[PDB]
């Protein structure tokens, strides 16, 4: 399958500035699924080299958290792909400065393991959908503006 690293997808990064106090992306990122909402459906737990599933019996290996650190640093591998995954977190008592990576080792020209397909396309997500959800999104989690534009 995979042995050496060829690829994978290449280093991902994605910028936004979410103008938020570091405790509010603390709920968005290295947190419970609130963080995951915007990720991936997960109750992700800021949880270091540990491995964790969306339920109490977690079956086989899961997730695991490489490295976790108060919205400073996040690093996860998730589910079935080999990425290590990780948020970047400015803590700022002004607003917060979000860098996030999305990253992984060891796979080759396809993806990090049922990402999707190419390891090219899964860094091809987060090269658009990624802002939309991080940029535009975890702003939103963080702060957002509106929710239910209509009626709820």
Do not use: Y
């Not at 997960?42 to 490489?66: A, I, M, R, T, W």
């Not at 987060?126 to 709820?152: C, Q, S």
Request: glycine share 8%; proline share 5%; charged share 25%.
């Amino acid at each position: 399958m995979a042995q050496n690293n060829e690829n994978a997808l290449p280093d991902i990064t994605k910028s936004i500035t979410l103008e938020a106090p570091i405790q509010k992306v603390w709920e968005t990122v290295s947190t419970s699924e609130g963080i995951a909402k915007w990720f991936m459906p997960n109750d992700f737990q800021l949880k270091e080299g540990q491995e964790f599933h969306l339920q109490s019996p977690f079956g086989p290996s899961p997730c695991k958290v490489l490295a976790v650190q108060a919205p400073t640093e996040l690093s996860f591998e998730w589910d079935t792909e080999g990425w290590v995954v990780t948020f970047q977190l400015e803590d700022l008592g002004e607003k917060t400065g979000f860098t996030l990576i999305h990253s992984g080792w060891k796979e080759p020209n396809q993806v990090i393991g049922k990402a999707n397909e190419k390891s090219s396309v899964v860094r091809g997500k987060m090269d658009g959908g990624w802002t939309g959800i991080v940029n535009e999104r975890l702003r939103k989690a963080v702060e957002e503006l509106e929710h239910h534009h209509h009626h709820h």
